[PDB]
């Protein structure tokens, strides 16, 4: 269950989304490590390489035993995600833990942003579909006219005075 | 929270998404690249809601996973079964300029719903002969011993 978040944080109507993909363990194989930020109009990807990632985690003081996805999940829980964009290049700050980590995001071509967007639409669809029952399990457990001259009011006989 | 369903709802990788918003009221089925919308007129909307509100019925159908889809390359017909009787809706393609803000808004809404749902789930020289540098530190001969 890869974490994700939307900015601005909280229940405020957001404009951006940040997420991660892959990270499958157990019977399956360890996939890639990609964190994408998009606003349904322009995607941004890490486009990192294993040597670049190793150098980045060595310079910032991390080791190979600390995965970044749990830190992203903790920041999502604490709402500690920030995005800075200059014109098309984004840098996300992850301040969930004691030290704020900085990650650099590059531009994404359209022929990759659009397929990613149309895959992520169904991705979030199935995610929310599963999370519905997940939260359920977690929380729950002529009349009026004289016939002689129709068009003239029907006449009743005179009665006069009758004491009661 | 407005209801939503994934077609098919099984463990198979989903392909189609259906949603409602507004309660001209329209029903949207999005393949993330193409959108089918009712675009019904107010008189037609009144006639359809009289013959069958639709949001509670749609929500019940989503919970019961009773939404049927029939599509032929331009046309969408939905069988909604969440109320007293089955609901039949006719949907057609919407232009791309109309769907682009719609798809952006639905993407943002899905993302924020997922984040809110996750939040609610959370709250629940060595070796060298120095005399001649460049040569191994010699060992004086020892001969034979007894072991």
Of A28, A12, A49, A35, which is closest to residue A116 (Cα–Cα)? A35
Q: State both tokens at A110.
A: 């359209």
- Taking a C-beta distance cutoff of 8 angstroms, is the pair B133, A23 a contact? no
Q: State both tokens at A79.
A: 């709402």
Experimental technique: cryo-EM
- Final resolution, Å: 5.3
DSSP state for residue A145 in the 8-state scheme: B
CB pairs under 8 A between A and B: 94
Peptide bond into B63 cis (omega under 30): no
DSSP state for residue A22 in the 8-state scheme: E
Cβ contact B111–A14 (<8 Å): yes
Which residues from chain A sit within 8 angstroms of residue B6, using beta carbons? 122, 125-126, 129
Q: What ranges in B52-123 are assigned the alpha helix state H?
A: 55-64, 96-122
Residues with Cβ within 8 Å of B88's Cβ and at least 6 positions away in sequence, in order, are: B77, B78, B79, B80
């Amino acid at each position: 269950s890869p974490p994700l978040c939307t900015l601005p944080p909280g229940p405020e109507p957001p404009r951006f989304v940040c997420y991660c993909e892959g990270e499958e363990s157990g019977e399956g194989d360890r996939g890639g490590f990609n964190l994408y930020v998009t606003d349904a109009a322009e995607l941004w990807s890490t486009c990192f390489t294993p040597d670049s990632l190793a150098a980045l985690k060595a310079r910032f003081g991390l080791s190979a035993a600390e995965d970044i996805t749990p830190r992203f999940r903790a920041a999502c829980e604490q709402q500690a995600v920030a995005l800075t964009l200059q014109e098309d290049r984004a840098s996300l700050t992850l301040s969930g833990g004691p030290s704020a980590l900085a990650f650099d995001l590059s531009k994404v071509p359209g022929p990759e942003a659009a397929p990613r967007l149309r895959a992520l639409t169904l991705g979030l669809a199935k995610r929310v579909w599963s999370l519905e029952r997940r939260l359920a399990a977690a929380e729950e457990t002529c009349p009026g006219e004289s016939l002689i001259n129709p068009g003239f009011k029907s006449k009743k006989p005179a009665g006069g005075v009758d004491f009661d």
